[PDB]
């Protein structure tokens with residue numbers, strides 16, 4: 058043919074370039090960290106069930122269709138659950154469905170940190186309490202993460218993992234999202250909150266304060282139960298992460 | 300029976316491009332500050348001033364025409380990531396009578412040379428200049444690799460706006 062109706066094939070780089078990058082056998086290693094990007098958590102052998110579900114929050118849908126509902130006055134927000142879209146009385150004006158609606162802040166820029174390797178910044182200002190991005194990875198058990206840590210993962214110096222309370226770990230060594238590049242600060246500007254979305258536990262990043270564009274996203278590693286093995290710059294710096 | 304060899308000096312930029320599009324959710328500044336048309340004209344001008352005076356220029360212009368045609372026929376269907384499809388639809392809507400060689404720039408031109416070998420060896424749009432393009436592409440790629448620094452950069456990429464993810 059010449060003269061042929063092409064069929065949409067999504068672009069993906071060829072096998073050789075991928076194999077050369079993964080094995081550091083090209084003209085120069087690109088400043089690109091090897092991790093697989095996922096859209097949602099991958100339950101390896103455990104599902105992080107929250108233990109409970111949502112309800113109908115009695116929140117009164119505002120007369121003005123643009124005012125947000127369930128804004129810090131909601132029952133589900135008091136139990137860290139996201140409103141079900143077909144039971145929330147606020148309907149389509151519900152603010153308490155940010156995670157399941159995939160309402161990220163799409164102003165995130167990766168960069169090379171000064172003494173931390175990788176880091177993330179925001180190219181737009183962010184009001185306080187705003188939802189940033191979900192921390193994605195492989196939901197593994199305690200034993201499976203110990204397996205991966207002792208016999209598979211070598212770069213323990215920068216652990217790409219977050220912990221869940223029930224002994225489960227969100228391992229972002231192999232698979233995850235950009236949130237694996239968010240480093241630590243003793244005086245953080247963000248916070249990791251655990252929410253019950255459709256009865257499953259999810260972890261989201263939220264703004265602890267107002268911040269202008271260009272600031273680096275940081276959260277406290279001590280306030281989240283994992284560092285079983287620092288140069289942040291704060292005045293009351295804890296010396297080492299712990 | 301045709302496979303295009305991408306220079307070793309260009310594969311790291313393809314890795315960077317994949318990382319910027321699929322994993323950092325960035326977009327190339329469309330329309331390009333220097334489009335495929337101007338890049339092809341720069342290559343033509345760089346090929347004119349050499350040893351063989353005037354006895355190679357016809358084939359050079361014909362190869363430029365073939366490259367532009369294959370880019371314009373393969374861009375929207377084979378040279379696009381899944382994340383760039385809303386941008387492609389917006390470009391098609393705003394500029395209907397504008398071939399892709401006027402909109403896109405160096406990275407998509409490079410992406411052409413990783414899948415053109417399928418169409419050259421099985422569905423060639425022109426069998427009268429097929430053998431000439433096969434002769435010249437492994438030198439056009441060398442030109443691109445020599446100018447990689449000025450052609451390919453992360454400065455032409457921007458973080459996608461939040462309304463783009465809603466598409």
Ligand SMILES: C[S@@+](CC[C@H](N)C(=O)[O-])C[C@H]1O[C@@H](n2cnc3c(N)ncnc32)[C@H](O)[C@@H]1O
Nearest residue numbers: 172173174175214215216238239240241288289
């Ligand atoms: C999940 S990684 C975050 C991204 C990481 N900085 C990178 O380059 O990929 C956490 C690691 O970052 C490093 N890190 C975090 N805060 C740091 C700081 N204030 N100074 C130096 N390194 C830091 C620590 O080594 C920690 O193990």
Ligand SMILES: [Zn+2]
Nearest residue numbers: 114116127131
């Ligand atoms: Zn509510």
Ligand SMILES: [Zn+2]
Nearest residue numbers: 127140145151
């Ligand atoms: Zn609600």
Ligand SMILES: [Zn+2]
Nearest residue numbers: 243289294295
């Ligand atoms: Zn510190």
